């Protein structure tokens, strides 16, 4: 089985399964956070952000991926909350901007769209802290760009993205002393990986069940 092109219907499903997988793990993500500051529970905030995106998408489906991305982007903007939820919205509003003109995308454009999200979030900060959700997103996009050059199949691509995203996540305690000593990976990066894992599920035809 393989995926050569992703249209608005499949992207909508990726968004839905990614959001549900993140929602199932939101309490986990919150509990990994070393800095549960006021209104700063990472799992809660990323879940609110992603779910607002999900809800807009579910009420305005479209087979044109660019139009669906604009709907996703709108929901992300309204839902964005917290440091990690805002970064999540920059990553995916940048992603959606990169496909706004398209009706479907191939593996190369999928990878370029992840990269466009990373560049958005980096353009919006002056020297970001390594060891955070941004680091995981950066390494995931780098992987996507490397792999897309000789993989037409978006399933195989997304699996690779997840493997390397997970490597980056597990390495975040080596970038920040506080994570190594507490003994946890970065919570925002964990939440991001939950979204990616749901994307793969959608690409495989599979449903994330509600916890």
Author numbering: 0 to 210
Paper quotes:
To provide mechanistic insight during the catalytic cycle of FakA, we solved the structure of a novel apo form (Apo-FakA_N) and ATP analog bound form (AMP-PNP-FakA_N) as well as the previously solved ADP bound form (ADP-FakA_N). Superposition of Apo- and AMP-PNP-FakA_N yielded an RMSD deviation of 0.48 Å between Cα atoms (201 residues) indicating relatively little difference in the overall structure of the α-helical barrel. However, major differences were observed in the loops connecting α1/α2 and α5/α6. In Apo-FakA_N, the α1-2 loop protrudes away from the FakA ligand binding site; we predict this prevents premature binding of the other protein partner through steric hindrance. Hydrogen bonds between Asn44 and Asp38 with Arg80 stabilize this open form of FakA N-term, before ATP binding, then collapse and destabilize when in the ATP bound, closed form. Our interpretation is that the open state prevents protein-protein interactions when not bound by ATP. However, upon ATP binding, the gate collapses and the face of Fak_N changes to accommodate its interacting partner.
Gram-positive bacteria utilize a Fatty Acid Kinase (FAK) complex to harvest fatty acids from the environment. The N-terminal domain binds ATP and is where kinase activity occurs. Each of these structures formed a similar overall fold comprising a bundle of eight α-helices termed α1: G7-L31, α2: T41-N58, α3: I64-G78, α4: G81-I98, α5: S106-K122, α6: I132-N149, α7: C153-N173 and α9: S186-L202 and a short helix termed α8: A176-V181.
